[PDB]
Design an enzyme around this catalytic site. Structure first.
Site, PDB file in Angstrom:
ATOM      1  N   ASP A 190       0.963  -0.910   0.077  1.00  0.00           N
ATOM      2  CA  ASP A 190       0.480   0.020   0.191  1.00  0.00           C
ATOM      3  C   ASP A 190       0.886   1.714   0.458  1.00  0.00           C
ATOM      4  OD1 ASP A 190      -2.853   1.120   0.482  1.00  0.00           O
ATOM      5  OD2 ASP A 190      -1.460   2.301   1.951  1.00  0.00           O
ATOM      6  N   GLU A 216       1.153  -0.349  -4.909  1.00  0.00           N
ATOM      7  CA  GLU A 216       0.566   0.928  -6.051  1.00  0.00           C
ATOM      8  C   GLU A 216       1.275   1.636  -5.803  1.00  0.00           C
ATOM      9  OE1 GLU A 216      -3.824   1.402  -5.573  1.00  0.00           O
ATOM     10  OE2 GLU A 216      -3.012   2.783  -4.366  1.00  0.00           O
TER      11      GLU A 216
END
Ligand SMILES: [Ca+2]
Ligand SMILES: [Ca+2]
EC number: 3.2.1.60
Length: 415
Positions: A190, A216
């Site tokens: 993340d 991400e």
């Protein structure tokens, strides 16, 4: 299922993954304390539907709450205790065991950038003044400082110094714990703009070197300073650079940006369409996730960058027939009625042998997107929102129809 890193050492686990995102944003509210139970009950269906991997919610308990409203979803966890809003520790082990036992590798969403520093009852209590926190150092703005070599989450007061040896090791050990006790086959990282990409490579090398990785990086060119080469670079170049340094596949936000802002013809400018196999094979493609997309429940979820209704089938046909590694969003698959269509496309991908490094050629002279994909077993011709009449217009060989949906706006033929 084939294992293995890419020729450049990128952890795409053989290039043959087909991933389900195994949650939506409002799961902790729509199915209180019950999601792991549901995933265990659904494991055989997920496997039958053709998924090789499932992206699990953040397993670290999150009891945050804010008021639009939210909290508890995992991205503001207060420690690594697994008894959170998705279910108990025991229920997680049972779900991961059922998923892995059905052949679905378990990928955990992990959130190293920050934690719920202020939560009053937690197992991880890091004081100030020892360098554990970004704001132990001067923090003039959203850019690296002397206690944090990446960007910050909102005001930065909860950002961890992930490069501090104790903090690095805390996450290293927890990734190992997820692999040994919770069946992890890899990790989804993340907010990777928040910390050095090389630290992801280090974490994976230490604790899960042969596992699957995806990060991400959601950061457009305009978010970089004017002296940074990324300020005038393409989205492809930005996420590819991250993947190089993390040795990790990267979510194809170049494709997402084109799906949101450009034409269907322009979808060829995602990372997964790049003619260099070292570029396209590290792309992890998706249609929407829990952040960009809608979710069932309150406020329709987050829907920060959602793909319109009229393009959902086209988008799934593109990512499931093309290179890179595709991800299917829970709610498209199991809530909103696209499941049978997606099932068919997964079967087409597998029967053709399309993988992350398969070649893809784009054809001019027609409306929409027309592509030839060279799978290991079959060649595919894909025509989305196109006036192409038949595959013989753009490809040599004998073809039969594999997909014909949405009044011909989605057509796939196979050799
Ligand atoms: Ca694999
Ligand atoms: Ca940070």
């Amino acid at each position: 299922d084939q294992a293995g890193k890419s020729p450049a050492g990128v952890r795409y686990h053989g290039g043959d993954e087909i991933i389900l995102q195994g949650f939506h944003w409002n799961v902790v509210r729509e199915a209180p304390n019950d999601w792991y139970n549901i995933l265990r009950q659904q494991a055989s269906t997920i496997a039958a539907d053709g998924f090789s991997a499932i992206w699990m919610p953040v397993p670290w308990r999150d009891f945050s709450s804010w008021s639009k409203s939210g909290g508890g979803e995992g991205y503001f966890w207060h420690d690594f205790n697994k008894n959170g809003r998705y279910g108990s520790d025991a229920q997680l082990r049972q779900a991961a065991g059922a998923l892995g036992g059905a052949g679905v590798k378990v990928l955990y969403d992990v959130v190293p950038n920050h934690m719920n520093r202020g939560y009053p009852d937690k197992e991880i209590n890091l004081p100030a003044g020892q360098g554990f926190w970004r704001n132990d150092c001067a923090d003039p703005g959203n850019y690296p400082n002397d206690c944090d070599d990446g960007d910050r989450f909102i005001g930065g007061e909860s950002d961890l110094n992930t490069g501090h040896p104790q903090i690095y090791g805390m996450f290293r050990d927890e990734l190992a714990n997820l692999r040994s006790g919770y069946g992890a086959g890899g990790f989804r990282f993340d907010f990777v703009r928040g910390y050095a990409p090389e630290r992801v490579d280090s974490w994976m090398s230490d604790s899960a070197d042969s596992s699957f990785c995806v990060g991400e990086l959601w950061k457009g060119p305009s978010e970089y300073p004017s002296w940074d080469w990324r300020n005038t670079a393409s989205w492809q170049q930005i996420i590819k650079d991250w993947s190089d340094r993390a040795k990790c596949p990267v979510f194809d936000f170049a494709l997402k940006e084109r799906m949101q802002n450009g034409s269907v013809a322009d979808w060829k400018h995602g990372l997964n369409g790049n003619p260099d196999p070292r570029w396209r094979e590290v792309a992890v493609t998706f249609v929407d996730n829990h952040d960009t997309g809608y979710s069932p429940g309150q406020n329709g979820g987050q829907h920060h960058w959602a793909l319109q209704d009229g393009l959902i089938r086209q988008a799934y046909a593109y990512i499931l027939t093309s290179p890179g590694t595709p991800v299917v969003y829970w709610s498209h698959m199991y809530d909103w009625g696209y499941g049978d269509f997606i099932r068919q496309l997964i079967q087409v991908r597998r029967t053709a042998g399309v993988r992350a490094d398969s070649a893809i050629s784009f054809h001019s002279g027609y409306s929409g997107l027309v592509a030839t994909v060279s799978g290991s077993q079959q060649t595919l011709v894909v025509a989305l929102n196109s006036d192409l009449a038949n595959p013989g217009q753009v490809a040599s060989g004998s073809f039969s129809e594999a997909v014909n949906a949405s009044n011909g706006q989605v057509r796939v033929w196979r050799s």
